[PDB]
């Protein structure tokens, strides 16, 4: 079968694929199902925003993506506890709750507490009975719009650094190096044996 110069092609068509093929001609219909599903979700609720649970702020776990940031799933129980509010109180406020999430980094941890202080500043709620506890006055006709768009706070807003200008100094262009990667990379590979070779040097005696 093969011939003059061409690439080896191995397609996966020995398996009788024509019985099992999903065809996307139902693609405009579901798209109109789903706008009319979100808009049916829009006019049920009330003043509360669609996509209304607020999400936390989470850095992306790898070496590849950890220089960007992402709306996670739920505020940490210990994050949310620094704001001081109880668990199932908080979901009625409209905050997402996640028990699985730790907090190793207080720069991460306090950044979400600032976000909850933001949202609880942001919040205009309504009571059942106007006994005036954590409630709102006649407030900007339900604050000028009932519903928000794509999260309440624009969760990405990925923060950039300027560090605008500086003079270059002595002893940085004198000392820094390529080689202080290579010296340190080779330092890490030999920490085990350099510990042991000197340990059996003094164990010899």
């Amino acid at each position: 079968a093969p011939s003059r110069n061409g690439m080896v092609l191995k397609p996966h068509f020995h398996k009788d694929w024509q019985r099992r093929v999903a065809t996307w001609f139902n693609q405009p219909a579901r798209k109109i199902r789903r706008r009319k599903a979100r808009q049916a979700k829009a006019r049920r609720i009330a003043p509360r925003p669609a996509s209304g649970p607020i999400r936390p702020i989470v850095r992306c776990p790898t070496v590849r993506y950890h220089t960007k940031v992402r709306a996670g799933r739920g505020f940490s129980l210990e994050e949310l506890r620094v704001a001081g509010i109880h668990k199932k109180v908080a979901r009625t406020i409209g905050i997402s709750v996640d028990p699985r999430r730790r907090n190793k980094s207080t720069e991460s941890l306090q950044a979400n507490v600032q976000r909850l202080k933001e949202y609880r500043s942001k919040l205009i709620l309504f009571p059942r009975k106007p006994s005036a506890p954590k409630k709102g006055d006649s407030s900007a006709e339900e604050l000028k719009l009932a519903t928000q768009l794509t999260g309440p706070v624009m969760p990405v807003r990925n923060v950039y650094k300027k560090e605008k200008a500086r003079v270059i100094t002595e002893e940085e262009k004198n000392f820094k190096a390529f080689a202080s990667l290579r010296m340190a990379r080779a330092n890490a590979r030999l920490f085990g044996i350099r510990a042991k070779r000197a340990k059996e040097a003094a164990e010899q005696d």
Binding site: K15, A22, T23
Partner: protein, 203 residues
Amino acid sequence: GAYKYIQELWRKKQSDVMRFLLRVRCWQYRQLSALHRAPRPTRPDKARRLGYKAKQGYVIYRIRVRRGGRKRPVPKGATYGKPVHHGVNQLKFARSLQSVAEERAGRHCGALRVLNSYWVGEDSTYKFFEVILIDPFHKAIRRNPDTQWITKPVHKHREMRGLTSAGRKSRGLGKGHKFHHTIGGSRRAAWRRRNTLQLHRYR
């Protein structure tokens, strides 16, 4: 108070005090028939952590199965295939014996709904189980909204679609790197979407 002690005494099931009690009860059940009613569960701890609350509506059918794998039903071992498929005497049947014990009970009494099952003995050839059964129409279970859920008829014949704890441990579902073979719902719904071709509008 004592359900920790029953648990711990039934835990070590090789000592003298218990190996008598296991060996007599292995004799005790073998002279009875294939399916009958134990009036109350003979491991009252173990039934209770599976869902037995000692009131009306819950039956125990002590049930018996034979050990061993399965022999393929081709006549004289003539299997008429390639030299892989001469597997006559050594095939071992992708369900457990406990799941077989759940099947025979619940289809014997189709009024009832299987909940779970547990181990009560094996000596040479037989292997004896109990099966806890829920009557989805008695008023003790159609009230009490903890356990209303088993009436709603998507839970009809839970054992024979493989849905009890004996059934989940059959299909092999879990999470992570040890369970990639069944990535949505089941291994057949895994194969369906991992070998559907997506033939698109704009491709």
